Design a protein around this ligand. Structure first.
Ligand SMILES: Nc1nc2c(ncn2[C@@H]2O[C@H](COP(=O)(O)OP(=O)(O)O)[C@@H](O)[C@H]2O)c(=O)[nH]1
Ligand SMILES: Nc1nc2c(ncn2[C@@H]2O[C@H](COP(=O)(O)OP(=O)(O)O)[C@@H](O)[C@H]2O)c(=O)[nH]1
Ligand SMILES: [Mg+2]
Lengths: 83, 269, 183, 25, 429, 429
């Protein structure tokens, strides 16, 4: 579970819940402000064979809403970090 | 607009009622008639062709605390003591209206075979081309009883008032037809519809009071008609109680037992 | 409630003609219903109380249990319709030695019996409309050897049809009854 | 496999005779 | 309090014969009739099912009946088949042809006279008879067609005696005939009217228990039959042995039947585990309750989760205390209150018998009058109407003297039973 | 006070089997399930890992998982295979194929339902459990995928109880596959916010433990697994045996987790003596503490020179005085305080248990939260960037319903974890 839902389901007082939440958000803000190693991305001018595929691989192919939820959660995450 | 209210009630009940008549005369022919001179067609080939993400950036990492309860515990059955989900089984639907199959009185009415017509007045009445007491009751009365499941005009009124007239007149011709009047009443009562139920209750009171030994003949057939009475006398209660009173009064000595066996919440009249 | 009010001749506690007849009555309803219907026998609207369980659903006057009646009239006349079903009524009265004594009459009762607080009787009701007359003073003397002071509460159970409940000081005749008390 | 009833297992001929007469002495 | 048993048809014959096997095993009865039990309690109440002869042989109080003669020979060829009385073996020259009409009107009637003769002969020997038990399948011709007439005439002759029947309800995905809906529809209303309590057996559920609850590779009719015999013997545990809270057939019927129509029950048995996990499982009455109320453990193939419980009955066997035989029922009650009817508080009758089944330290049998029994007859009526719409396979029944009106009335009676269960499923306080 | 354990993958299953062998030896439980221990202390708290059956057999509280049934057959045919409950062996037909996506989304999901059914049954069967243990390898398909799915579901279901997982992080010098970066990253970014505490295992350190401390001839996977088993036994010894200074998993979690995301621990064991040098060294508390804090004694292959101890915990077993078991912790905290951080003073948690592992008069298990543990994460991340930069071997994972966004988020979380460890690696005074 996410932390917000976890404390929503837990048995803390409201002030204690917001206190734990604030502790976690401030830890995560400090983590964001901390220095990292850049998230590497696929190279430009990548081989075509890396992308285009075969019929066997399209047979073994088993998402848009999932990606939209991911992007929305991320966007609110950096919005909270900026705020 | 009372016409609008009646129309809206029939619109709401359409999904459960038998399919409506396609007009005052009958079903329309499919793809009928022809143009006066029409407009011919020439279309070229080109124009015819034209026509669960988990964010590792938030979560309960090292915060196992005694104040946390799980989510999904109240959804995961078979855990302990729960042989099913807490939502519970769905509604049985016994109180809900049941689909009404089409009536044979309908088809016999589109066929020019019924000897009755409509006369218009403050309340419309029935004009019979042949006098009532000389009808073939064994053939006609079950048809009218089966027609009680109709609600759309005019079939509902035709069946209702025809049943009332054929029970008011006829005397001793009604008793031999009792065994074959049970199936139409069964199908009408299974409609699970308040209007059909009220019409059937009025019909059963009229049938019981019309002749002699009618209640005696209905007594052995209490196996079929009483389930709906029991079902709806607690959720109409007054009319069901009146029908039960009349049935016990004109049913003889076995009426009490045969109503006790089917309606536990019943008392002597 | 009627301690300070005039109590002589007639005192109706229930009447099926008023706009809201249950002002002083608590419609304690459970698996039943209390409603005003139109009786075919008299072509008039009367109270109509149904219930699978006679004990659970009923109407009781006064509505407030702490509050109580103050009617001195020793006769209680009830115009009720026999519905061919189990029926009962309850009358709590105050005796001279200051006990609340509780007289009940039911149609499902077998034989009358007296117990230190209650006196239960069976009733036989003729078909159709009935005018039950209940002589509180005489029956209190008969079942308790104790004077009757005044009635505290009336509670007629469900499963019946009711026209009018009224207390009278003496056994009025049908001719002597006022036209509005007729049937 | 014990077929003794609960009446038998809980309801037994109970002897109050002294097991140890040393304490009595 | 002697129960007298009868087994009708091929399915009924095998089920009853091995049921007598199980009864003899738990009472210490040698297949040759002699007694070898090591406990006096086995012989204390052996007269309920067995009658002693001059030589001490214990003959079952059973009537074996079927139109086919080969099934009698097969049952006698059974390991305990020598136990039954030879004159009880009553059979016809020709079989029912898997026809309810042939089994009920023409061939069954000519032999039901002898059936009643032997039944009365065995009933009169009992000082105070408790009732009649029947075992049959409603998908067959002679087990259902003649069994229902037997139940009707036993109801006529002995109204107060308790009529228990075990009806093996047929079903589509294990169907092995084309007239299961015909026979079942022609038998259901007789079972409703003439039986005190009719409890149902479904082959999908027995087979499912064999596959997943018992985890045995190749279940047989013998295995399902053993499963049903377990609860068949367990239902009279309090009758045959003492216990903390005794009970009997009529007490169970009273506690399980609120209205005369509602007397169709599910089935239940616990513990049931594979041979490889026999010693790993910690046998306890709480686990017994959990498994018994588990939907899969029911040996009737209709999910109890889709309906509501009128009443339940838990006949526990084995030495146990009262804590988890009452508090466990209370716990399941107030934890699945959405699955239990409100206007019948504490839907669970609990009875305790001290003697456990042989090979088990503790056990329990379940009798459930859930509303999901209407799902028995939804599919049966759908199949019956599917066949009856085009009047197919009906000349066989009509050539034996049956009218189409009886089929229509059978439809009406099943529909009435289904609606009767539905109204109490959705009934509110 | 009890812990229920799960084994995921072939590595996890073998490690769990060795751990259960060690625990059974400590508690005096032979493979058939009986008890032959010669002390009451073995029975007083045997309920921590074993549940008593009807016959007295002690079934381990273990749940086995692998899509490959070959390891299931191997573990059940092993010397202690008969100990485990037959129904707890949960396996699939087709293996995970070294695919985190296949073991977490496609094939793991279809089996995780029954897995949670078994774990829920065991958890509710036992009374009041301290928590859940899991053993697996992050470089595999089902050990990482299904292991992380199990951890997520158990955090969904029982957040009240502690969670401890033994993850075998692969090393390039031991790497026997090519998808270590993908699998390890996709597992660690789960365990960061799912597992309550996750101590690390590296076969690279396990190999040279057998050399710099054991000097043994033929080290195998079974030889390696005994180290993990012994450290598990030392971790959970205090729950099973009394001690002067008692501790449990929640106590270790509180004392070793300063911030919620910093719960990855570096772990070791002592004594680790060779057969040749067994009699040469004189074992004492000083030697035990020196071996605890020796860099080469760690069973995870990250260099502790480059990091600073966030916290440390010494779990001593045996017969020792208290002042010289605290004075040696003081001694190290003074001698080499550069290993430690100033903002958290007195970084060492200590516990004393009176019962040592079989064959020891004194022993100790060391669990350290250090800023050096991110070395393995950095190396795995470098390999991950090398592989993912050219989209190598990503079609296998994308064809099982997973997207590139999962890998991106995993890399982001791994970088965040590495950075938050590297916060305090600077040797400030
Ligand atoms: N459980 C069980 N069911 C059986 C057995 N033998 C037959 N059946 C069922 O009985 C049905 C057929 O019954 P049938 O033999 O025709 O009954 P009969 O016509 O009265 O002899 C089939 O659907 C089978 O599933 C048995 O030994 N055990
Ligand atoms: N310590 C130890 N490591 C093992 C064992 N078996 C496999 N491994 C390691 O695990 C890695 C392969 O993981 P794998 O077994 O395929 O994981 P799975 O697919 O989830 O079963 C290899 O690099 C081995 O070093 C074992 O028994 N003990
Ligand atoms: Mg008794």
């Amino acid at each position: 579970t996410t932390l917000e839902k976890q404390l929503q389901a837990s048995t803390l007082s409201r002030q204690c819940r917001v206190d734990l939440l604030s502790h976690a958000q401030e830890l995560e803000r400090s983590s964001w402000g901390l220095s990292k190693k850049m998230i590497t991305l696929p190279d430009i001018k990548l081989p075509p064979a890396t992308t285009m595929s075969t019929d066997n691989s399209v047979k073994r192919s088993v998402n848009k809403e999932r990606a939209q939820e991911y992007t929305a959660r991320k966007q609110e995450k950096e919005d909270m970090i900026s705020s | 607009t009372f016409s609008q209210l009646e129309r809206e009630k029939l619109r709401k009940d359409r999904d459960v009622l038998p399919p409506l008549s396609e007009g005052p005369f009958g079903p329309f022919p499919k793809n009928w008639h022809q143009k006066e001179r029409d407009a011919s067609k020439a279309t070229v080939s080109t124009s015819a062709s034209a026509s669960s993400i988990l964010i590792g950036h938030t979560g309960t990492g090292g915060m196992a605390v005694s104040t946390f309860k799980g989510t999904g515990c109240a959804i995961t059955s078979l855990s302990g003591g729960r042989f099913g989900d807490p939502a519970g089984p769905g509604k049985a639907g016994a109180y809900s209206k049941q689909r009404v199959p089409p009536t044979d009185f309908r088809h016999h009415y589109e066929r020019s075979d019924l000897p009755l017509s409509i006369q218009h007045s403050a309340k419309r009445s029935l004009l019979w081309k042949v006098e009532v007491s000389k009808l073939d009751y064994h053939h006609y009365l079950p048809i009218f009883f089966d027609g009680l499941r109709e609600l759309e005009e005019p079939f509902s009124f035709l069946a209702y008032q025809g049943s009332m007239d054929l029970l008011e007149g006829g005397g001793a011709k009604i008793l031999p037809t009792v065994p074959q009047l049970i199936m139409p009443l069964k199908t009408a009562l299974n409609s699970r519809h308040p209007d059909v139920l009220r019409k059937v209750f009025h019909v059963i009171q009229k049938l019981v009071v019309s002749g002699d030994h009618i209640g005696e003949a209905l007594v052995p057939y209490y196996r079929q008609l009483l389930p709906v009475f029991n079902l709806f006398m607690n959720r109409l209660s007054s009319i069901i109680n009146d029908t039960l009173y009349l049935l016990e009064r004109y049913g003889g000595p076995d009426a009490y037992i045969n109503i006790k066996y089917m309606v536990p919440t019943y008392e002597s009249c | 409630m009627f301690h300070n009010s005039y109590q002589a001749g007639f005192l109706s506690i229930l009447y099926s003609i008023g706009s809201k007849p249950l002002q002083i009555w608590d419609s304690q309803v459970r698996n039943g219903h209390v409603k005003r219907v139109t009786d075919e026998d008299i072509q008039s609207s009367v109270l109509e109380i149904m219930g699978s369980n006679v004990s659970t659903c009923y109407i009781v006057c006064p509505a407030n249990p702490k509050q109580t009646l103050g009617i001195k009239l020793p006769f209680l006349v009830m115009i009720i319709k026999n519905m061919k079903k189990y029926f009962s009524f309850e009358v709590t009265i105050l005796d001279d030695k200051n006990m609340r004594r509780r007289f009940r009459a039911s149609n499902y009762q077998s034989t009358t019996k007296v117990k230190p607080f209650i006196c239960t009787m069976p009733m036989r009701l003729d078909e159709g409309w009935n005018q039950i007359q209940f002589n509180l003073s005489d029956f209190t003397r008969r079942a308790y050897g104790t004077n009757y002071v005044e009635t505290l509460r009336v509670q007629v159970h469900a499963n019946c049809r009711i026209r009018r409940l009224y207390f009278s000081d003496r056994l009025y005749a049908e001719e002597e009854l006022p036209p509005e008390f007729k049937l | 496999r014990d077929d003794r009833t609960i009446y038998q297992v809980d309801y037994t001929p109970k002897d109050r005779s002294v097991k140890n007469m040393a304490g009595l002495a | 309090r002697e129960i007298v048993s009868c087994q009708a048809g091929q399915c009924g014959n095998q089920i009853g014969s091995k049921f007598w096997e199980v009864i003899s095993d738990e009472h210490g009865v040698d297949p040759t009739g002699t007694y070898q039990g090591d406990s006096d309690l086995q012989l204390e109440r052996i007269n309920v099912y067995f009658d002693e002869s001059s030589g001490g042989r214990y003959v079952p109080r059973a009537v074996l009946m079927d139109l086919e003669p080969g099934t009698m020979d097969s049952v006698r060829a059974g390991p305990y088949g020598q136990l039954f009385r030879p004159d009880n073996f009553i059979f016809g020259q020709s079989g029912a042809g898997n026809n309810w009409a042939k089994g009920h009107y023409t061939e069954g009637a000519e032999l039901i006279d002898s059936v009643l003769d032997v039944c009365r002969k065995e009933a009169e020997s009992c000082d105070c008879l408790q009732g009649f038990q029947l075992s049959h399948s409603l998908g067959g011709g002679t087990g259902s067609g003649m069994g229902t007439l037997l139940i009707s005439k036993l109801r006529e002759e002995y109204p107060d005696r308790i009529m228990m029947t075990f009806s093996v309800i047929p079903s589509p995905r294990v169907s092995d005939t084309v007239v299961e809906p015909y026979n079942t529809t022609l038998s259901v209303h007789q079972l409703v009217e003439n039986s005190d309590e009719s409890m149902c057996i479904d082959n999908e559920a027995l087979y499912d228990i064999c596959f997943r609850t018992l985890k045995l590779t190749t279940p047989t009719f013998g295995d399902l039959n053993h499963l049903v015999a377990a609860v068949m013997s367990g239902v009279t545990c309090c009758l045959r042995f003492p216990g903390q809270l005794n009970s009997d057939l009529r007490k169970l019927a009273v506690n399980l039947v609120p209205f005369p129509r509602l007397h169709f029950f599910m089935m239940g048995f616990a513990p049931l585990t594979s041979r490889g996990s026999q010693q790993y499982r910690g046998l306890s009455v709480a686990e017994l309750t959990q498994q018994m109320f588990d939907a899969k453990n029911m040996m009737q193939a209709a999910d109890p989760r889709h309906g509501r419980y009128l009443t339940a009955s838990a006949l526990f066997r084995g030495r146990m205390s009262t804590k988890e035989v009452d508090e466990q029922m209370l716990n399941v009650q107030n934890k699945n209150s959405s699955y239990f009817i409100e206007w019948i508080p504490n839907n669970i009758k609990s009875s305790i018998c001290d003697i456990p089944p042989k090979g088990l330290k503790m056990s329990v049998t379940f009798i459930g009058n859930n509303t999901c029994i209407q799902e028995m007859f939804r599919r049966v009526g759908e199949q019956f109407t599917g066949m009856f719409r085009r009047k197919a396979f009906l000349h066989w029944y009509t050539g034996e003297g049956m009218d189409e009106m009886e089929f229509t009335e059978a439809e009406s009676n099943m529909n009435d039973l289904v609606s009767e269960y539905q109204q109490y499923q959705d009934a509110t306080v």
